[PDB]
């Protein structure tokens, strides 16, 4: 028994239409909702610092619905050749934060209005070259 962050399980459907689960660290807030404190790698329509309602099933906390979006954006990237240096620089310039899953998959958090024509244009240019592919997993405020 050691001190740990609370853990949220998000059920989602993968690219093969099969059920999958992603676990995210965060905090159970005084109102009983959950503050997400990791950048989601796979679950859709969620971002770092979103506040979500939960359903408890014994020892597990499951995502139920979004209560308050942080306004952050989540971009997933698969690297097909190499990660371009100017893309890394642009992520940093726009206050982005990277979470890696191995060397060739990453999720990037952008604060409100930091993902816009600048980053979308660079990502599109590298898709055209088949250097990477990206998903707009979460686009911020609905």
Contact by Cβ (8 Å): 119, 75: yes
Q: How many Å apart are CA 104 and CA 82, to the nearest integer? A: 8
* Of 35 and 77, CB closest to a copy of itself: 35
Shortest distance (Å) from residue 58 CB to a copy of itself: 8
Shortest distance (Å) from residue 9 CB to a copy of itself: 7
The terminus-to-terminus CA distance of the chain in angstroms comes to: 40
Q: How many Å apart are CA 141 and CA 112, to the nearest integer? A: 9
Does 85 participate in binding a copy of itself (rule CB under 8 A)? no
List the one residue from 15, 19, 30, 32 that touches a copy of itself (CB under 8 A): 19
Does 4 participate in binding a copy of itself (rule CB under 8 A)? yes
Does 2 participate in binding a copy of itself (rule CB under 8 A)? yes
Nearest CA among 89, 110, 90 for reference residue 99? 110
Locus of tokens 């676990």? 23
Residues of this chain that interact with Cl ion (CB under 5 A) are 3-4, 12-13, 38-39, 99
Residues of this chain that interact with a copy of itself (CB under 8 A) are 2-4, 9, 11, 19, 21, 55, 57-58, 60, 62
């Amino acid at each position: 028994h050691h001190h740990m962050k609370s853990k949220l399980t998000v059920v989602y459907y993968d690219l093969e239409s099969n059920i999958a689960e992603e676990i995210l660290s965060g905090n159970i807030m005084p109102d009983g909702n959950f503050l997400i404190q990791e950048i989601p790698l796979f679950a859709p329509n969620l971002a770092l610092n979103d506040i979500v309602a939960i359903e408890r099933e014994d020892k597990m906390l499951f995502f139920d619905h979004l209560i308050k979006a942080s306004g952050n954006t989540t971009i997933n990237i698969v690297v097909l050749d190499h990660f371009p240096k100017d893309l890394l620089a642009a992520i940093e310039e726009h206050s982005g934060k990277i979470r890696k899953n191995g060397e060739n998959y990453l999720s990037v958090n952008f604060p409100p209005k930091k993902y816009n024509s600048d980053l979308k244009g660079i990502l599109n240019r590298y898709e055209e070259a088949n250097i990477l592919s990206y998903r707009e997993a979460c686009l911020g405020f609905s």
